[PDB]
Amino acid sequence: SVPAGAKCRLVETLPENMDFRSDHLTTFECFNEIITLAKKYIYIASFCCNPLSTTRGALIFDKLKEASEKGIKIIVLLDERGKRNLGELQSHCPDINFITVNIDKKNNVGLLLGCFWVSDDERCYVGNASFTGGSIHTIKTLGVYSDYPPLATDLRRRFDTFKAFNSAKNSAANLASAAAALPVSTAYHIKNPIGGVFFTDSPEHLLGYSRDLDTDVVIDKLKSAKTSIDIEHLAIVPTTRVDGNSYYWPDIYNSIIEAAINRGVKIRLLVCNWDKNDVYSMATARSLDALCVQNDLSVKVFTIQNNTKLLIVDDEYVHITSANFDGTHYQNHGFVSFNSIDKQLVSEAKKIFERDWVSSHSKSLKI
Amino acid sequence: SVPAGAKCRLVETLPENMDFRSDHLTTFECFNEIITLAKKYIYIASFCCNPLSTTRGALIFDKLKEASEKGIKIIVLLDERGKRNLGELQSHCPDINFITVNIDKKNNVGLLLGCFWVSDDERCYVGNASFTGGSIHTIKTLGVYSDYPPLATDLRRRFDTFKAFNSAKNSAANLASAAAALPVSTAYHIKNPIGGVFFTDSPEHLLGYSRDLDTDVVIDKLKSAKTSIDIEHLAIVPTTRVDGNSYYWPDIYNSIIEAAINRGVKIRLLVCNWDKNDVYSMATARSLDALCVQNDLSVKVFTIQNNTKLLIVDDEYVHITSANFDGTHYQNHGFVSFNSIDKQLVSEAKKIFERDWVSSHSKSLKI
């Protein structure tokens, strides 16, 4: 028999300067358990790699340094734009195999946002706590830990698809034939969960034929919302700025409004504050301001460093990821998202959203 | 051989209290020519029927009264919500067959917005000048007249589909079997124009299998815009209010923004002013205000009574109709739209839009 929830428990970073308190596992405690119980390998992936920026991040980097010196195969994947610290990371850990990743060499837009750990095909972490000292110590994060082998092995297959994109000779990033010979395998998806948990992937040109697009799954869960929509992300502005040109993409921005106006869904949004010089964020904020007074919608903002990417629908489906709901992320960026329908696991996630909604850092939307 | 433009020339209403001037045919001159040259029948359709509200409208109603007394079969289609004047219209013209129409008895939402004339299968008018004294004399309108038999006959087939929906015993409005036996025929569409002119229809449950949806054709022409988008409609607010509940529909609202931001299309919009008490119109206006300063977009408003529904794309495609770009109209309301790609006919339409854009009634968008 398979366990309910796939042995998943919540993991988050709650800095001391913030009022967030919980009994769940912490991100610092989570990374120590993965390195301690490691016997075969430790595979880590994130956008930027910089553990030495805080105290707790350096201790995790020392435990990973000691693990690499005992025979554990350590491979760290980072986007080629976090290449500044590469000379610093290799100088402190010569046994750790640092690999730069460029998943999109056709247009140089897709970034490696896969934020997850995996070890021995048994234990794994996934969330938005990137391999940075801030995301371990000073930046609020939110993730999930599970010691279930079948769930960690399916996340390891996500690592194999991302590892092939290396800026070194002929590979999945340089050849079109070596990239088509990639086994893009997934053991579980929205049509076959494991313990009520499944992974959604991104972008579309890296799904193959079996994996499900995270864009289609999130939109379907938002269009199928009946009672409540709770989102804690960076921003839900439908317009992003790639290079020096603005990009418009309101797919997520419309499926949420379709729930509040047409279906009367009680929606609560918790995004960051916005630049007053950004006309796309001011117009988006004033558009949401007229909806809170006309429908059952509520918006609060915060100014702290928080990478939390949370989505809860009808207290029945939860969605934790590292990418933000926008056009640039769900069209080009590569990442893996956590999807679960376990009522007990969603209830603990609803407990976290209610904590952050009434927190002192969450001031009401004022324009 | 077939003539270019299908013998089409512009027709509009330019009241004396307004500064609009042109050498084209007027709506009052257009209705006199149709009644004078009538030999077989005159079929008229609009939402509300009230010709006696102005001077020119009463003269058209007298010419139509004299035509009905000579043997011309006069059938007037009006929506069952314009039934107030029905006792007045029949009292002045007993020989004219007035018919109330309810195209949607399933939900009582679809309204008869078909605004067109047709006579002898030879001459026909189509636009937004409804059968009202205002739309002939005091309300600015815009339409097209053509004495081409094949184009008028295809518009008569639109009248046959609308006439079947009568609130009288068993018919297309009462029976589901008598409504399926309806010949829903079109001779020309977007895949087969006549002289560069074709009709698009609405709603979707009245198209059959041959007619093209006006919603799909307009969105495709907006998504295929390369240089310019010129629209003169009532309003492009993505939210409408059906009954006492708001309805959200941004399909047209998004395809236009996709052109200005992603494709850099120079777009000029001329809509009416909005109620300051309407939060959906204020948020929509402030959203457009931040786009005019960030992209090549310009918006002007007017307060006069104007039913003009115009759409020009890249000076190559023109779209004149009676319904407004919104959710309630293109989802439920029944109407026929004028579509033409004739360069000479679009050039005359571009001449009209430039006149209304710099007119004194078109004040710049101020918030």
Author numbering:
A (entry chain A), B (entry chain A): 6 to 372
What does the paper say about this structure?
We also assayed one escape mutant (G277C) identified in vitro but never reported in mpox patients. The mutations identified in the clinical MPXV strains were located at the homodimerization interface and were expected to have an impact on tecovirimat-induced dimer formation, whereas G277C was located further away. Consistently, the mass photometry assay showed that sF13A295E, sF134MUT and sF13ΔN267 did not form homodimers in the presence of tecovirimat at the range of concentrations tested, whereas sF13G277C did as the wild-type protein. As controls, we generated three additional viruses bearing substitutions in F13 known to confer tecovirimat resistance: rVACVG277C, rVACV4MUT and rVACVA295E. As expected, all the control viruses could be rescued and grew to high titres.
